[PDB]
Design a protein around this ligand. Sequence first.
Ligand SMILES: O=[N+]([O-])c1ccc2nn[nH]c2c1
Length: 247
Amino acid sequence: PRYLKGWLKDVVQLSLRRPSFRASRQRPIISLNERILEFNKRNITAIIAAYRRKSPCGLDVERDPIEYSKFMERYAVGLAIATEEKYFNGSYETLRKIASSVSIPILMWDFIVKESQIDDAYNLGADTVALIVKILTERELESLLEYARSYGMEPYIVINDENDLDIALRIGARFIEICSRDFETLEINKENQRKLISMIPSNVVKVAWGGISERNEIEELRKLGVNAFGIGSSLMRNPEKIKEFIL
Ligand SMILES: O=[N+]([O-])c1ccc2nn[nH]c2c1
């Protein structure tokens, strides 16, 4: 990966030593970006609900993932499952189990640093995997994207600043997350996110992920051309809010 600092260096040092999940896949690949695109044409608000136990920030929520996922299946466009243990208190078994109970698309939220994690994602039943620009070299990024595409999955490229977007466009991304939170400082900047969203071309699937708590933000970002809107801690405390975000 790139030369890193703080907690990002650690989560990356650990992700490499993380051992694989070696068991055959037991569900089809259900395209998230494609279903999002369909939702837009169907005028439905597309929301990726996140099943994350603990924030990297550090504040846990213990709840049955199968009751959450099953509920979300009825409303969400897709499910983002946090599978990092140290800072996100998630696991591969939480993914495998959720993926066995739901039929909507599933996104693996992790710090992918090696090809095996992309095998893990497939095998466990994840429909797509998140690739963080801020955490990989350009050629590492081009390889993982290619590898995930050799599995049928269309990688979910996370950008944070105008530099991440430069590399994102250079690698040939077609599914972009515009993270309003800086991975190292853990701060939200909606001005910066909005600027970045304006710079991403029409043909690319856009996900505004930050600290979304109300519909008026989703309306605003939609008026700015974003396709899907990722919510986590807001839905992790109260999952029923989704009905209001859809409205
Ligand atoms: O906890 N998550 O499933 C999740 C998904 C996407 C994200 N982008 N930034 N943080 C994220 C967290």
